[PDB]
Design a protein around this ligand. Structure first.
Ligand SMILES: O=C[C@H](O)[C@@H](O)[C@H](O)[C@H](O)COP(=O)(O)O
Ligand SMILES: O=C[C@H](O)[C@@H](O)[C@H](O)[C@H](O)COP(=O)(O)O
Lengths: 564, 564
């Protein structure tokens, strides 16, 4: 391909970090706690959310292979790569998404201060606020029962039709903020083009009382349009079977969240029912825009404003807080330390909150689709590793699933443990039992259990058999020194969720800027789309192909032989 | 710790594989297709499931960096490490789980041939079949409406209470086999000790018509017992609020799936309502046993027998088929090639079937908890990498989520694409549109798009701007040579699911045997449990601690200050 990038590896700070890794990389995490009695406080930052309930976002990054020399060197890397100036460029509307020559302004969607942000010489704030007001008005009509279906019924089911950035945010947020929702409104999500997805939703709803929301930035995504057309056919099929006149039904049951005004009109949706968003709103950064309509319908306008405000508080913290006390910058640098120096290619998101069960899948798109790049903005091949593989499940289910590998496997896996001090559901002693695991797991990963400790524990329990002690000894040994970040909030309120997502959006921004890549494009999805479009007309019963490789030919031919 | 293991790295076959990697590792996958026109057929195996619908399990492992010399060398590794003899030892009941001195007989649970398998000189088959008959009788009473609640109502809600191996199988299988289910029976799963899990289920059920199933091998797991006690308190609280006599209510609403007869009696469950399983049934291999009761209640006895039969067909294939035509052995060897020689520490499970959306989470436990070990059976430290990190989501949602990283990231990620030729839900042209992506993605990962191909595509579309071509060129380039395995079935029937899970169970067996580890124990979960038990009595409002490291002390102290 192109020439190799030297801008990052030639930085004096990068050379120093490589030197510091060779020197201190083998030192166990516990050693840093033994030499610094105030490590927990010195390697942690509390950011107030500015609400009356005194909620906060506390990051503890102390359980890491980072001493003061490494922390200082990581901060110097941030200065050398011009992170401060890059952040200002993003926030002010500069076209940082260089491959598409477009601004990156998801921060404008939640700009509660209404500080003017310009695109093509025009302040975008009145347009942002106009859509938020349109969302308020419509969501209130749905929630109060004012918005009626074709047969006069109030809305009981809300079906979002969209994929990726037009699905994951709405799913994650409605699940995360379920205690703040209106329970009489059932939320359904159709995303997969697999006929099963729309089929199962159609079995679970009363189409007369259903509002379909077609969410798509482009309004041309094959999955979404195919599902939307089937949802429309279903509405018309129901009315026809009951003998009811179908004229004007689509306008009462369908709304659109898009940037493409022309494609929305071709479908048959009223322009009054189109909720606009812009090109500078990336799909994986769109839950704050019109895409957030199903979230607003579920939790209400005031709670949606709280979600936006939480993000805004972290946006202001990120842009203004000093480097050594900046939460998203520190989280990003700890990540760069593990990815580029330790060679850790995986990162676990472990939320100890059942409502946040869809957070790992959301962060998979946010991080992996943003930073899974191998070429820089200048078009040169990267000389370092970029985005890691994100995985995880809600705690404690993970403990009885894959923690065995995190504790005793052959891979170094940085983990983010997210938890809340207060539960929304106070059932007996469930929360303290739950949180005992939250604190214990990070402690366990850090300290481990040495061969000598295992021998003392077995001999203290009364085991006089030297054979059984020696045989079980290595299997019961925990090397420890496994890193983790602990993110603690007072409670998972809409403001708290907004804060958490914005923190991760900004972590991704910093990592992408350090590597010199474009965290805002997605050229990697194009080949699969083009080759699928070429294979589609070849999928007919009995048809034989020979234009692809022998594997693909054999697979398509077998499919055609047995499809029908 | 202990001495380093030399048994694997000293194998002549291992030394040869390292030599073959140095020689052929840089050769692109497409080169093997260009030199062998019959590669698709030669590097694929079709295993019949033995059913009247002519269903099968087809594995295509051709899209890999494997030529005939490497394939032969991988098969020689299997012979040298004694896989054939190890498999016979597992199937015949030998105590292969050396650290716990116990047999590994999940294959006995689905042994439809009723071939005698001995443990302590006694055939286990009559006991296996006795529980299957008990499950048949009870599941039929629940399904027909014969089993009544305390107030005389038929069962409408089935709530499984269990975690890990007592949760993931029941969740995955009931979701996977939803078209074969009895729709009037709503399945709920309480697993997390987070109060939210039981709370949300209690909001969704009619407790008078609810059967609670307490699933736990040991019947002492903190999460499960805490949830079970809250479910019991909920039943008694409801009856008390309505003024109804509670005597004999627990026996009508609670059943247990366990090995511990004593702990089940202490809870208050009738011995007639305890479904037994044994110590040789590992939790992550228990969906075929009594643990499968919620699956049988949902899909019925005949469909559960089909699930068992699918597993049995693959068990027989695995134990008897020649090495070069053995599906789980080949899948395991392709995995070893990528993990130990290419250094690929991640593996993606990408099922193109929405019903299989919980399959990746299931396989995470199966693979990661089994093979995430760093010590051998002999107690020596491994000299090779072991179990990889498993992740994934159902296709096509993954395409618009993280495929950007699989195609254009800095990591080599082996992928397993699983799909069905026939859908259970035939909605318009959804399935062909869906499957066009299935074939295209593996083709895309393999062939890529070279710098020259991108230039030809842009110049053919009419782009005369050399600047735009050169600028977009590297961003639109796909290096290709990304591996994948394609698993194709005729349709996802209960027999097909059984076949797929057994294949993965056996893949895990082979990989663990090659590495010389115990794939059947889980000592790695002990430290987190012990440290949580120590932290639990310290979680009281206002309490201050100083016995842990400064991070854990600071976290517990902050929690205690604001919990109440
Ligand atoms: O940044 C987001 C990604 O590019 C991707 O997840 C995108 O959101 C989907 O491809 C759906 O696109 P539409 O929203 O245009 O349907
Ligand atoms: O092999 C399985 C694992 O050890 C683990 O997932 C186990 O299933 C859970 O710890 C629940 O154990 P019980 O089934 O005993 O509650």
């Amino acid at each position: 391909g192109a020439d190799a990038d030297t801008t990052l590896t030639s930085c004096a700070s990068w050379t120093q970090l490589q030197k510091l890794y060779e020197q201190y990389g083998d030192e166990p995490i516990k050693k840093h706690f033994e030499t610094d009695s105030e490590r927990g406080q010195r390697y942690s930052v509390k950011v107030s959310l500015g609400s009356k309930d005194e909620n906060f976002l506390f990051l503890d990054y102390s359980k890491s292979h980072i001493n003061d020399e490494i922390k200082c060197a990581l901060l110097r890397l941030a200065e050398e790569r011009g992170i401060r100036q890059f952040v200002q460029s993003v926030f002010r509307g500069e076209r940082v998404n260089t491959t598409e020559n477009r601004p990156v302004l998801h921060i404008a969607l939640r700009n509660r201060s209404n500080r003017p942000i310009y695109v093509d010489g025009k302040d975008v704030m009145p347009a942002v606020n106009k859509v938020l007001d349109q969302m308020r008005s419509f969501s209130e009509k749905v929630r109060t029962g004012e918005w009626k279906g074709h047969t006069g019924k109030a809305i009981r089911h809300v079906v979002n039709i969209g994929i990726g950035g037009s699905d994951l945010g709405p799913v994650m947020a409605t699940e995360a903020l379920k205690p703040f929702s209106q329970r009489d409104l059932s939320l359904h999500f159709v995303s997969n083009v697999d006929g099963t997805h729309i089929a199962e939703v159609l079995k679970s709803i009363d189409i007369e009382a259903t509002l379909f929301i077609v969410a798509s930035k482009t309004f041309t995504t094959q999955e979404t349009i195919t599902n939307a057309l089937s949802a429309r056919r279903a509405l018309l099929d129901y009315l026809r079977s009951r003998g009811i006149d179908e004229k004007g039904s689509v306008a009462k049951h369908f709304v659109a969240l898009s940037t493409n005004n022309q494609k929305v009109k071709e479908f048959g949706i009223d322009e009054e029912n189109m909720f606009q968003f812009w090109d500078w709103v990336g799909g994986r950064y769109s839950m704050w825009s019109a895409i957030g309509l199903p979230i607003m319908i579920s939790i209400g306008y005031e709670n949606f404003v709280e979600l936006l405000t939480g993000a805004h508080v972290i946006d202001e913290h990120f842009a203004n807080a000093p480097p050594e006390q900046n939460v998203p910058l520190l989280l990003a640098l700890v990540g760069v330390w593990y990815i580029n120096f330790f060679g850790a290619v995986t990162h676990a998101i472990l939320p100890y909150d059942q409502y946040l069960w869809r957070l790992p899948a959301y962060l998979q798109q946010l991080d992996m689709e943003s930073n899974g790049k191998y070429v820089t903005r200048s078009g040169k091949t990267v000389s370092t590793l970029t985005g890691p593989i994100i995985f995880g499940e809600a705690g404690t289910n993970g403990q009885h699933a894959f923690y065995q590998l995190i504790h005793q496997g052959t891979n170094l896996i940085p983990c983010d443990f997210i938890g809340a001090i207060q539960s929304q559901n106070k059932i007996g002693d469930h929360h303290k039992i739950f949180m005992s695991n939250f604190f214990a797991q990070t402690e366990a990963l850090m300290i481990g259990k040495s061969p000598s400790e295992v021998r003392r524990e077995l001999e203290a329990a009364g085991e006089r058999s030297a054979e059984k002690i020696n045989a079980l000894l290595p299997h019961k040994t925990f090397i420890g020194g496994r890193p983790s970040n602990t993110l603690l909030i007072k409670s998972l309120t809409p403001r708290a969720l907004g804060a958490i997502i914005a923190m991760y959006e900004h972590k991704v921004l910093v990592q992408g800027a350090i590597w010199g890549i474009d965290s805002y494009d997605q050229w990697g999805v194009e080949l699969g789309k083009v080759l699928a479009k070429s294979i589609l007309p070849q999928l007919r019963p009995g048809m034989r192909v020979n234009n692809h490789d022998s594997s693909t030919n054999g697979l398509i031919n077998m499919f055609n032989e047995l499809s029908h």
